[model samples]
Target: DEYEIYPIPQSIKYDNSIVTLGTDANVVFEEGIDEATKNRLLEVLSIKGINHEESNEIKEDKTNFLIGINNSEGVVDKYFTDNNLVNDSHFENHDAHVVSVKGNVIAVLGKNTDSAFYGITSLKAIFNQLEGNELKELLIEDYSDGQWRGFIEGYYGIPWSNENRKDLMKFGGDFKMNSYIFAPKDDQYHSLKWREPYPAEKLAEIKEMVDVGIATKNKFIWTIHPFLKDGMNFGSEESYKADLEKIIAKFEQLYSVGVRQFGVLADDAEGEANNQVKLMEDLEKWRLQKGDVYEFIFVPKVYTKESAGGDVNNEYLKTIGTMPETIDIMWTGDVILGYVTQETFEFFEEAVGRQAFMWLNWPVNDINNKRLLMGKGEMLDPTVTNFKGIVTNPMQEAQASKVALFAIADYGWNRADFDMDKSWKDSFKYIEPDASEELYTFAKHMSDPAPNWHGLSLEESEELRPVIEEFTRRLWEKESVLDYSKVILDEYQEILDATNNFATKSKNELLKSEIKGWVDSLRDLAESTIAYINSAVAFEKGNYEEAMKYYVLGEEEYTASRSHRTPVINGQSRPEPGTRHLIPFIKDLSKIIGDN
Candidate 1:
C-alpha cells in the first residue's frame, strides 16, 4: 500500500525518466560534509549492494548521486540554481531538503548537516523499495512544519535497558526525529537517588547513549528530579543553596560526556513558587556561564491547568511566568489531557512567560499495564502557533510503542495536514514488510485508551460480533460454537505469528525480549479463547463436570494473559479487565451446571 515513500515528502513531482542502478555509479560528497556523515552515506550505499565511487568532484560520464550541504559548490546546488528548484532563503530553514532525479543523475541539497543526513536516509528507503534497482525521475522539496520532535522515557515502570534506549534513538532518527529525553521514573538516579552520581560503569553506559544520538543527529537531553530526599523548601535558604549545588554537580557529570541539553523535572513533587523560581534561576545562570551554548529545560510541578485549580491564570502560573526567558518550560495541557485545543495552548502561554513545550501522554501505559495505548495520535491544535513542540510519553512496552510514536512524528512534521488512517497504515510499513494487515488487526483490537477512555467501541469490535452472538446463543441452548470460536482464535494466532516474524527479522536482542514477552501474553489470550470453545463442546456432549473444568482452564489463561504481573490501573495495583468475552459467558454456563 505504501508505494511512494513513508511520511510522504511535503512536495514532489515525477516524470517518465528511469535510471538503472549498477556498480559503476558514483557517490559524490560535497566539500563541507564531515567524516562521520560521509561514512554513513557510504554505509547506506554499501548496504544496498550498490558499487560506487566516492569523490569531492562530480564525474559527468557515470550515474551519480551528488550529496552535499545546501550552499556547497556541487552539482546539487547547480541543479537547484539552474532549475529554480529552491529559493535563496531555503538553506536557513531546519529539516529542509531538495532532491532532484533526472536520467542517471540524482542530486540532494539539505539546509544543514542533519537535514542532509535525513536526505541520505530518505534515498536509502526509496532504494530499498525499488524494483530491479531502477528508479523513476522525480523532484522533491520537503521540510517539517514542526520543530523539536522526539520521545521522552518518563514512565513509572520497568525501565528500558541500555540497548533498548539506543534502539529507540536509532528508530527515531529514521523518522527524522531530532530529540530524545531520558527521564525514566524507575531509574533510581533519575528520581529516588537523584543526588548521587552514577557508578563509573553506569556512567559509561549513559555516555554510549549520548554518542548514539550524536551519530544519528539527535539531541539527547539528560534530566534529574532532585526533590525526593531533601524536598524543595525555600524556607531553609541555606539547605536549598546546597541542594542547588548538588543538582548543578549532577549536570556537570553529564556535561563531561558531551551532553549539552539538560532538563530539571519537578513533577510529582511538592514545591512552592519561590523555591521553583529560584531553582530555575540558578540553572539558567549555570547554563549561561557555560558559554551560553547549553539548553536548560524545566518541568514545573503545577504544569497543567487541572493541577492548578482548572485555571491557567492561577497565582502559581503567574509566578512561574516570571522565570528568565532563556529557560524553556513544559506542560501536559491539563493533567494527561486527552485532546489539546487551541484555547488550552493560548491560555497556558498567556499565563506562562513563553510557549510551553508539550509533553503529550498519548500512548503511555505505565499507570495501567493491562491496557496498551495503540490508538493514533490526535487533538493537536495546528492553528495555534505558541507551542514550541510536542514529545510523546510512550508505553513501557518499547516495541509496542512504535505504532503511536510513528503517528506522533507524522503529526509533529506536518500538524496541519496529518491523516490518521494513512499514517496508521504507514506505521506497519515502518515496522514489517509482510503481515501488515495482521499487525494492524492486532493493534486495533488492543486499542484501549488509558485513564478513563473506553476499550474498542461497538463498531470497532464488529468483527467479533457474530462470534460473540453465536457463543451466547449456543450457551442458551445445548449446542457447540466451536466453528464460531475458531474464527476468533485464528485471528489471534495470525497476530502472534506476525509479531513473532517481525521480532525474528528485526534481529535486535532487546527488541526480541520486549516483543516476545507481549507475544507470549497474546498466545495466552488465544489459548483462553480456544479453551472456551472446548468448554462449549463438552456441554454439547453432556459432560457437565468436564465443561466446568474447561471453563476454569479458559479463565486461568485469561488471567495469565496480562504482560505485567500487577495491573496498575489509574495508579492503583489491581486485576486487569478481562480481554475475552467468552470468559464471562463461561461463568454463566457454570451457574447453569451448578458446579455439577
Candidate 2:
C-alpha cells in the first residue's frame, strides 16, 4: 500500500514489488553528497527504524541506497546513465530531482546540492507516510517552476517565537518551498530602528535562523524596511550619508551570518522618488560589487495596482524601474489583500519595467487580529510565469497560519494539479493528524475574511452556509421545517462538540492557546445557530410564544458570540464568526417566522 505525498510530484511511478531493508541496509554516497544532505538522509533513516551503514560500495541483493547530484560526480553520472534514470535535459528545469527504486538498488539524484537536498525532503515525506519497515517500490521525478515559495514574517502584530520560526521553515521545506523571507514587521530593529545596529542577542538569534535555513536548504532573506522619517534620519546630506553607511553595514553584518538574498521594503510611505530608488539602487550596486549575492528584492512605495494608479510606464514607476534586472520588484497584486490573478501580476511587471514578485497578503491576521483566516489560499492563475516568486505574508500566530500556508505551498509548486479542497483537507491532517476532525469543523466557519476594508473576500462558513440556505429555502417555500430543522440543529451541535474537543481535550497545547479566544467564539456561534433552529421548529409547530422566546435567546447568543483580541492595535476590531451567509439566514428565518 502507498500513502500520498503533499504537493504531488511532477511525475511518479510505482512498482508492484516492495523492497525489504534488512539490518544490513547500507547507504553509498556518490562522492558529491554534501554533509547537510547526507546528515538529513541518515537522520530520517535512523528515525524510520533503518540502521544504515556508511559505505562506498553497493551491496548486491541487500537494500543499497545511492545518493548524489547527477552531473556533480563521475560515479553519479555513470550510475544515472547505466540505470537510464536521467535524460540530457533532465535537470534544465528549476531545482530538478529524481528518485528511483529497482529491487534492492535505490537511488536519489539532483541537478545540484540544493536540488539533492530537496530530493531528500521528498523522500522524508514518503518515509513519514510509511507504517512499517516494508517499503513499496517507488520512483519520483520532481521540480518546481517557481524558484521561491514561503512566507515573509511581515505582520504588524507580535513576532513569532524562535521555535515558531524554526518549525515553519522545516514545514515549508517539507512541501518543497525553498525560501523564507525574514521581515517581521513589528520588530523594532527591522523597521522602527532600521539604521541602528542590532544588539548582540538579537543578531545571534537571527544567525541561528540563517544557520537553520542552510541546514534545511532554504534561503533566509533578511529584508530591511525603513519607514521614511521613523527608521531612518535623512535630514541633511550628512545624515543621509550616515544612514546609507548604517544600512550597508547592516547588510554586511547579516551577510557574515550567511544571509545572501536581500530585500529593501519601502511599502507604507509616500516615499520620495529619487530617495527610495537610490536606496535600492545603491544596495543593488553594492550587491554587484560583492558579486556573490543570490538576488536583490525591492518592494517600492507604489507596490500594488491601486497604488500605481495603473502606472504602466507612469513617471513614479519609471523612476524606480530604472533598477537593474537583477533587482526583483514585489507587488501585492490589485489591493493589499486581493487574489493574485495573472492579469494583475503582469500589470505590475509592465509598470515596474522588470519581472514582478508577489507579496501575497492572505492568511495574515494583523488587520483583523481577532480572526484566524483558516482556509485555502485563493490564487487563481495556473501560470504567473513571468513573476519571480509568490512569497506570502503570514500571521502572528505561527502554527495557526499553516492551515492556509499549506495550500499556498502546494499551489506554488504544483499549480496545474492544485486541488483547493484536497490541499485544504490535507493541511489539517498533516499539521495534526489526531485532531484534524476538530480543525476541519472549526476552519469551515472561520475561513472567510469578510467585512474587511482591504478588498472583496471569499465566502464565509462555506461548509455550513449551504445547509442554512436549504433550511431557509424550505421554510420560504412553505415546506415542513421540522426534519430539516433537526438536521441543521444536529450539525451545529457537532460543531460545538468539535470546538470543545479542540479547546480542552486535544494535545496541541500551543495551538489551543493561540486560537483559544476564537474557539470560544465558534462555540457561541454554534449555540446561537442551534437556538435559531429550535425557534424555527417551534414556529412550524404553531408554538408562537415558544418561538418568540427561542428567537430572543438566539439573538442574545449572537450578540455574545463576538470574539475579542489583545490590545495589538486600538483593540476596536471584533471579528465576526459565521456572520456572512449563515447568520444572515438565521436572522431572515426570524423575520419569516415573525411574519407568519
Give lDDT per model, in order.
0.69, 0.77
Please write out the lDDT profile of model 2 over residues 1-596, one tens digit for every residue: 56588777888889788877666677887677778788878866776777778787778857887788877655656778877866758788888999887788778888887788778777788888777777788888888867677888887777788888888887787787877888876677777677777898989999998888877766688888775566555578887788889889888888888888887787765557777766776777888888878888788888778877876877778887886777777888888885768788778767777767788887887766666788766654655566667888877878888876687678777777788877888888888777888987777777666666775477567777778889888988888988888788888889889978875556877677777777777777777778778888888898989988988888887877774544354445554566567567767866887775
lDDT of 1 at 558: 71
Give the candidate number with the greatest TM-score: 2
Per-prediction tally of clashes? 0, 0
Candidate 1 ranges beyond 4 A from true positions: 1-4, 71-79, 89-94, 186-197, 226-249, 268-275, 278-282, 285-294, 378-386, 432-441, 449-509, 515-518, 530-596
Q: Which tens-of-lDDT digit does each residue in 215-279 have in candidate 1?
A: 77666899887654465546577877877777888888988887888887877657667667788
Clashing pairs in 1: none
Least accurate 10 contiguous residues by lDDT in model 2: 563-572
CA-only RMSD, every prediction: 4.8, 2.8
